[PDB]
């Protein structure tokens, strides 16, 4: 299923293409909708870039304190934190938090560059057992979200399983995992997306993403009250290049799958 029917109805009403994967770690059950189709990740890919740097820091413990220059030449389209630090330096920790909590695109590019570019972030995904994730481009072009274009895409199923590994599993060391979760719980951009469809008492760590074709995404680890955690990925994209974001569709998808 009945949840399936309701998601299909939501997708039809929304006019777009909706991809949902819920992992309920209470019973290892899944709710899936278009969960093997590819969707442009847009800013949700920043979680994988931050995780790759965190993984590197397991071998180089001072890595996160390493300072990175921010130059005018680094600015791109959306740099709310980086623009405050032009001609100075930010640590890799600060850049990670900036990418995850403000969706700063300079921060993302600096994370990508540090680990060796999009192919290296992808190789990190492969090391985790995620053969679906692909990061092809840097910011800002990885957000074009052209229909049929596989660049910078993943599936809901793969992203949900990978997010589970990163936040609830053992992909990262305890310190690094805790840091990732702390950052995602501190996200400032998600209140209108998955969170808006959940009870106020639940704790969410999430990363939103938006891009071309009205692509509106959110990936979340959810701690319900007195329940085992959930992983929820909601990806949404629309047929018109200039379509507006529909965060309400993700909130509605979240409400449907957690009732």
Contact footprint for Na ion (CB under 5 A): 130, 133, 154, 158-159, 162
CB of residue 247 vs Cl ion: minimum separation in angstroms?
Answer: 19
Cis before 140 (ω within 30): yes
Contact partner at residue 39 from Cl ion, Na ion, none, CB < 5 to 8 Å by partner kind: none
CB of residue 59 vs Na ion: minimum separation in angstroms?
Answer: 23
x/- mask, Cl ion, residues 152-191, rule CB under 5 A, reads ----------------------------------------
CB of residue 33 vs Cl ion: minimum separation in angstroms?
Answer: 25
Contact partner at residue 13 from Na ion, Cl ion, none, CB < 5 to 8 Å by partner kind: none
Contact partner at residue 133 from Cl ion, Na ion, none, CB < 5 to 8 Å by partner kind: Na ion
Q: What is the rounded distance in angstroms from the CA atom of residue 180 to the CA atom of residue 228? A: 19
147 binds Cl ion (CB under 5 A): no
Is 43 an annotated catalytic residue? yes
Contact partner at residue 239 from Cl ion, Na ion, none, CB < 5 to 8 Å by partner kind: none
**Residues within window 223-252 making contact with Cl ion, judged by CB under 5 A:** 240-242
Residue 52: name the closest of 104, 137, 141, 117 by CA.
117
Q: CB within 8 A of 58, min separation 6: which ones?
A: 172, 173, 176
Distances (CA, A) of 74 to 66, 87, 108, 130: 18, 10, 11, 30
- The CB density around residue 29, as the number of other CB atoms within 10 Å, is 9
Residue 3: name the closest of 215, 173, 213, 258 by CA.
258
Residue number with CB closer to Na ion (195 or 217): 217
Q: What is the rounded distance in angstroms from the CA atom of residue 222 to the CA atom of residue 26? A: 12
Binding site for Cl ion (CB under 5 A): 240-242
Residues designated catalytic: 43
């Amino acid at each position: 299923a009945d949840v399936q029917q309701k998601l299909a109805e939501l997708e039809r009403q929304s006019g777009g293409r909706l991809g949902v994967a819920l992992i309920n770690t209470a019973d290892n059950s899944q709710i899936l909708y278009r969960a093997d189709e590819r969707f442009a990740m847009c800013s949700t890919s920043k979680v994988m870039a931050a995780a790759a740097v965190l993984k590197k820091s397991e071998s180089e413990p001072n890595l996160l304190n390493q300072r990175v220059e921010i130059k005018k030449s680094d600015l791109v389209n959306y740099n709310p934190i980086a623009e405050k630090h032009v001609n100075g330096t930010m640590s890799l920790a600060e850049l990670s938090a900036a990418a995850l909590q403000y969706s700063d695109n300079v921060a993302m590019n600096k994370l990508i560059a540090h680990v060796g570019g999009p192919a290296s972030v992808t190789a990190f995904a492969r090391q985790l057992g995620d053969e679906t994730f692909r990061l092809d481009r840097t910011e800002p072009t990885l957000n074009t979200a052209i229909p049929g274009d596989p660049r910078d895409t993943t599936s809901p199923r793969a992203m949900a399983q990978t997010l589970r590994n990163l936040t609830l599993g053992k992909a990262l060391g305890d310190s690094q995992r805790a840091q990732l979760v702390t950052w995602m719980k501190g996200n400032t951009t998600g209140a209108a997306s998955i969170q808006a469809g959940l009870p106020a008492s639940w704790v969410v760590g999430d990363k939103t993403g938006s891009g071309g074709y009205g692509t509106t995404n959110d990936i979340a680890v959810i701690w319900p009250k007195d329940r085992a955690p959930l992983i929820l990925v909601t990806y949404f994209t629309q047929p018109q290049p200039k379509a507006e974001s529909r965060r309400d569709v993700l909130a509605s998808a979240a409400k449907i799958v957690t009732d």
